[PDB]
Amino acid sequence: NRFTANIKGLTQASRNANDGISIAQTTEGALNEINNNLQRVRELAVQSANS
Amino acid sequence: NRFTANIKGLTQASRNANDGISIAQTTEGALNEINNNLQRVRELAVQSANS
């Protein structure tokens, strides 16, 4: 009985962990978009600096 | 990420620098015209000097 419980818990635990990776990837997409927007802002600031 | 930022900044920086050269050339055209006007004035002064 103990082994069955562990096996169930491990698989389910494994099944939830994939979800954590998915959440990280989702955050990364948004973060990547933010970074892209930021790169443009820095370039614009450099252009803006000239007298 | 750092390299991308530098590359963006360098290109944009390079793009603004050409503009500096353009401004120098524009000033030089005006300056050249002023110099041409001045050359005539000096010659006129020399002509004017005679008794």
Using what technique was this structure determined?
cryo-EM
Listed by number, the residues of chain B in 20-39 with a beta carbon closer than 8 Å to a beta carbon of chain A are: 20
Residue keyed to tokens 């990776």: A21
A15/A9 Cα distance (integer angstroms): 10
- Best A41, A44, A50 member to test B by mutation, with max B CBs in 10 Å, is A50
Flag whether residue B15 sits within 8 Å of chain A, measured between CB atoms. Answer: yes
Q: How many CB atoms lie within 10 A of CB A46?
A: 17
Shortest Cα–Cα distance, B25 to chain A (Å) = 16
- Dig out the tokens for A46 from the structure: 């450099």
Residue keyed to tokens 């005539």: B40
Residue of B8, B19, B20 lying closest to A43 (CB–CB): B8
A2/A9 Cα distance (integer angstroms): 11
Contact B13 A42 (CB under 8 A): no
Name the resolution in angstroms: 3.6
Residue keyed to tokens 């450099």: A46
A44/B8 Cα distance (integer angstroms): 10
C-alpha distances out from residue A26 to A21, A23, A30, Å: 9, 5, 7
Q: Which of B2, A40, A36, B23 is nearest to A48 (CA)?
A: A40
